Design a protein around this ligand. Sequence first.
Ligand SMILES: O=C1Nc2ccccc2/C1=C\c1cccc(C(=O)O)c1
Ligand SMILES: O=C1Nc2ccccc2/C1=C\c1cccc(C(=O)O)c1
Lengths: 149, 149
Amino acid sequence: SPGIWQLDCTHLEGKVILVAVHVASGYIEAEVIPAETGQETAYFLLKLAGRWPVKTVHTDNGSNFTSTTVKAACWWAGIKQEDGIPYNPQSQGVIESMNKELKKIIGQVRDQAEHLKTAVQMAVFIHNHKRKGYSAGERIVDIIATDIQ
Amino acid sequence: SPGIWQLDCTHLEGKVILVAVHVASGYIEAEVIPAETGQETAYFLLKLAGRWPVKTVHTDNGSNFTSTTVKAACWWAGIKQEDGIPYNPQSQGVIESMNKELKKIIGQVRDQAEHLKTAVQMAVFIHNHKRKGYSAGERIVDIIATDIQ
Ligand SMILES: O=C1Nc2ccccc2/C1=C\c1cccc(C(=O)O)c1
Ligand SMILES: O=C1Nc2ccccc2/C1=C\c1cccc(C(=O)O)c1
């Protein structure tokens, strides 16, 4: 579980926000893209796996699961690509809740940024630093550090 | 020193590669931009600080040190912005060496990617995973985890 991430795609202002959630910690990375393509998803995963030790990715839908470009990026980066079917039904609900929370934060910062991408990165910052006590940022580092030792 | 990062700007294929190096570990994040502007640097730092606990940034040049947009992003994200003048002359040489090493890796992967940005992220991946025995990715996590406890 230190290496397990979940992909999540949500929509705002006619654009797409692609999110990777580290399941065990709640830590996220996100980007704005014009639309969800295999190529964009592939590039996003390459960035993620260069930054964190990504072992398994639960893909967000069947198109990205099937995508040859996504499969190539997962091969390149040593990621086991899996489906994202909630065998636990409380899982989708947690993502649903996270998308709602992220959009709430985006709303709270939206006027401080001209471009949506800036607001999204402010929201990532706030999300990862929020103490719940540890923050998601603290939890992911502790989880992975423990795993290394 | 767990929170200290150094900005570095290098050039390839008529484009600019902006790099943030975590000084204590050698871990890097990087992006390709058309040219180094205050706005691009500001956005890059916002992304970085949402992902890692960035306390201090040594800026790469006087224009970014002076930039009102960079100063605003540092204020927003709780980053102490400093100059990047090598009080130790072995510092610049280490960055010089890193740029050369990064460009070497980019060369080694360049044909596997159409776009430079893909090659750069492959290079970030290889750099951060290389065992030298721990990798830069392992070192940054251990450093920050120790600091939290
Ligand atoms: O001055 C600034 N405060 C910031 C605090 C955080 C991040 C950026 C800024 C920033 C300017 C900036 C730079 C790029 C894009 C955008 C945008 O409006 O999308 C604004
Ligand atoms: O099939 C693929 N293998 C990969 C291994 C790693 C990353 C991407 C790919 C990938 C395709 C892809 C996707 C986006 C851009 C580019 C580009 O050429 O810049 C290529």
